[PDB]
């Protein structure tokens, strides 16, 4: 940035041969577009380029404290006279040549010296890319923060933007397929997310998925539909369980509702 609020990021390191060069032989180290001025109206930067050129030519320092000039003694006139008395022109323009074609440019180019500050907002503190990494515990969504390798957030407005485009698979890929996609198990009989478990197998058998809610105890019920826990409590009951594709915050919401004493029944399509 200059000392006139003309902030901007560095867009390219232009090679010096491709930089435009002047009749003096010098190539500017900063290029600022002329379109930054008409709306911002920072004429102080223009007069500072003028005065800086004049000062670097005459080996002097010019003061810029406000209200030393007026409308009868214009800084343009002052620094222009100083520039004319050194061999450069009144208006601070210089004949420059294109560094790519070598032809002289269509008009004289406004050059000068202005004081430039380098701000602390580097790009090395701003870029972040995540493919996969650490996740939150109770949601299984990516963690927050650049310093922890955590994903960026697709909020409510981005969700509305995805709906507005009609891009349904885009919204699915953002909010489900790449955030907290889990292939959970749902009891087809009772429609509860988290009342099921893997059974502890016997020797040479295979573990199965079984519902706790939809199973009665083997003791209370006076070889295929009998399953065991780690504690050994035998069960004979609900094996009508399937697999769905849900988020994980859905399961956490189910637990937070169960804590409230509210049940959610999820009806699966094929029964």
């Amino acid at each position: 940035s200059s000392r006139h609020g003309q902030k901007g990021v560095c867009s390219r390191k232009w090679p010096t041969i491709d930089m435009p060069f002047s009749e003096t032989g010098i190539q500017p180290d900063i290029i600022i577009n002329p379109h930054a001025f008409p709306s911002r109206m920072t004429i102080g930067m223009f007069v500072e380029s003028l005065a800086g050129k004049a000062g670097a030519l005459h080996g002097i320092a010019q003061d810029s404290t406000p209200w030393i000039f007026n409308e009868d003694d214009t800084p343009a006139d002052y620094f222009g006279e100083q520039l004319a008395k050194a061999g450069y022109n009144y208006h601070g323009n210089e004949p420059m040549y294109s560094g790519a074609t070598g032809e002289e440019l269509r008009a004289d180019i406004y050059v000068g010296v202005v004081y430039y500050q380098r701000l602390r907002h580097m790009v090395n503190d701003k870029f972040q890319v995540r493919s996969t990494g650490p996740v939150n515990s109770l949601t299984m969504q990516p963690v927050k923060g650049r310093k922890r390798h955590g994903g960026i957030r697709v909020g409510e407005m981005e969700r509305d933007a995805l709906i507005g485009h009609g891009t349904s698979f885009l919204l699915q890929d953002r909010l489900l397929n790449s955030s907290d996609y889990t292939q959970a198990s749902v009891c087809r009989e009772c429609g509860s997310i988290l009342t099921t478990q893997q059974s502890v197998p016997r020797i040479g058998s295979i573990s199965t998925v079984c519902c706790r809610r939809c199973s009665m105890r083997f003791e209370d019920a006076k070889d295929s539909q009998i399953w065991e826990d780690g504690q050994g409590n035998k069960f004979v009951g609900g094996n009508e369980t399937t697999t769905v594709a849900i988020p994980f915050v859905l399961k956490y919401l189910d637990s937070e509702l169960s804590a409230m004493g509210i049940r959610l029944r999820y009806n699966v399509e094929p029964k």
Partner: peptide, 8 residues
Amino acid sequence: NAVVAVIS
């Protein structure tokens, strides 16, 4: 102090 060209 930088040499600044106001140029498009």
